[PDB]
Structures are given as structure tokens and as C-alpha cells.
């Protein structure tokens, strides 16, 4: 039993929900919350924006610090940094940014990831201003991840359209 609230059951470990990831993370305090990162650990927009920002910059302080002693992350790759006042621990994941050129197929690789935590409060991989499509996104992380996953989403139109098409 965990206190993650009003989620639709997709598969046996999946869950989704139409949700603001930042106001969940401040509800919850997840032992992990997944930021949609890239490479550089800049979060200027989209889900990365978003949780900095909750955190009065600190994470992008702590990103800057990171960066600069270990250089940047790989596509598909992941670190493990805090979670400041959201949850306990922040798994920055790098999926691919079609809007860069980066090759989808890296979605797989940047889902397994989340196997490395049992339970995680997380973004679709690659959607919104990363470019992919969410649909296949959602596909992805249903076949890749095996841990407990519980995806918020922000936009409710399309919160809608994943639960109707999803297979
Ligand atoms: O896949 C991640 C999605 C992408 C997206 C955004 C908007 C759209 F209209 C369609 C897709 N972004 C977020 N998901 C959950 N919580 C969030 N908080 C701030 C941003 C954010
Ligand atoms: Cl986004």
C-alpha cells in the first residue's frame, strides 16, 4: 500500500493519472520523482522547468554542480541526485528530444531506468516539448518498465485520448 491517490490501473505495475507532477510530488513526497531531463541538467521548460522552479532553483544548482565534476549525462542515460522539498530522491531521465534529431529508439533504453526503484512518481518519456508521441511513449513504458510506476499526464485532453486508445 502506498499513498498515491485517484490513479486508473493500466497493467499490473502501471498507473496513470491527469496531473500536475509538481503539485503530486508536494502531495506525496514520493521516495522518487522522475524529471524529464536532458543532457546538460538545464531545466528551463516543460516538466524540468516546472520542478525546478518548485524547488526555488535549487536543483538547478545542484544539476550545475553535478554537471561540472561528471560532465553530461548520455540520451537514454539517468542520475540520481535529491529531491529537495518534493520527494526523497530525483531520477533525472534523459529520453530523446525529436525536436534535437535524437533517435526514439532510446525511449527503451531511457525507461530502464525506472527498473532501478521500486516505486516512482513519473513523466511520459519524450512527450510534451521533448516531440515523440505520448501514445507510443505510454507503450514503451508499459512494456519496459517492470517496477511500480505512477504517471502524471498534465494535460487533460490528452489524459483523455491515452486512457481511450490505450491497448
Ligand atoms: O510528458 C510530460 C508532459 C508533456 C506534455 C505537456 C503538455 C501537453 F499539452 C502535452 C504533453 N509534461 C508534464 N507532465 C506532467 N506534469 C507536468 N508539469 C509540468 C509539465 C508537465
Ligand atoms: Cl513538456
Not at 52 to 68: F, G, H, L, P, R
Given at each position: 500500500?502506498?499513498?498515491?491517490?485517484?490513479?486508473?490501473?493500466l497493467t499490473?505495475?502501471?498507473?496513470i493519472?491527469?496531473?500536475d507532477?509538481?503539485?503530486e510530488?508536494k502531495?506525496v513526497?514520493?521516495?522518487?520523482?522522475?524529471?524529464?531531463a536532458?543532457?546538460?541538467l538545464?531545466?528551463?521548460?516543460?516538466?524540468?522547468?516546472?520542478l525546478?522552479?518548485?524547488?526555488?532553483?535549487?536543483?538547478?544548482?545542484?544539476?550545475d554542480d553535478y554537471?561540472?565534476?561528471?560532465?553530461?549525462?548520455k540520451?537514454?542515460?539517468?542520475?540520481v541526485?535529491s529531491?529537495?522539498?518534493?520527494?526523497?530522491?530525483?531520477l533525472?531521465?534523459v529520453?530523446?528530444?525529436?525536436?534535437?534529431?535524437?533517435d526514439?529508439?532510446?525511449?527503451?533504453?531511457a525507461?530502464?531506468?525506472?527498473?532501478q526503484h521500486?516505486?516512482?512518481?513519473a513523466?511520459?518519456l519524450?512527450?510534451?516539448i521533448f516531440g515523440?508521441?505520448?501514445?507510443?511513449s505510454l507503450?514503451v513504458?508499459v512494456?519496459?518498465?517492470?517496477?511500480?510506476?505512477?504517471?502524471?499526464?498534465?494535460?487533460?485532453?490528452?489524459?483523455?485520448?491515452?486512457?481511450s486508445?490505450?491497448?
Amino acid at each position: 500500500v502506498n499513498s498515491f491517490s485517484g490513479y486508473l490501473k493500466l497493467t499490473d505495475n502501471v498507473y496513470i493519472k491527469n496531473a500536475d507532477i509538481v503539485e503530486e510530488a508536494k502531495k506525496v513526497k514520493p521516495t522518487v520523482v522522475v524529471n524529464a531531463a536532458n543532457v546538460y541538467l538545464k531545466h528551463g521548460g516543460g516538466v524540468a522547468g516546472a520542478l525546478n522552479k518548485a524547488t526555488n532553483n535549487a536543483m538547478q544548482v545542484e544539476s550545475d554542480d553535478y554537471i561540472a565534476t561528471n560532465g553530461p549525462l548520455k540520451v537514454g542515460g539517468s542520475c540520481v541526485l535529491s529531491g529537495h522539498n518534493l520527494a526523497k530522491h530525483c531520477l533525472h531521465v534523459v529520453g530523446p528530444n525529436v525536436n534535437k534529431g535524437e533517435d526514439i529508439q532510446l525511449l527503451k533504453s531511457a525507461y530502464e531506468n525506472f527498473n532501478q526503484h521500486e516505486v516512482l512518481l513519473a513523466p511520459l518519456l519524450s512527450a510534451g516539448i521533448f516531440g515523440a508521441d505520448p501514445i507510443h511513449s505510454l507503450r514503451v513504458c508499459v512494456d519496459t518498465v517492470r517496477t511500480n510506476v505512477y504517471l502524471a499526464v498534465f494535460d487533460k485532453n490528452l489524459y483523455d485520448k491515452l486512457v481511450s486508445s490505450f491497448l
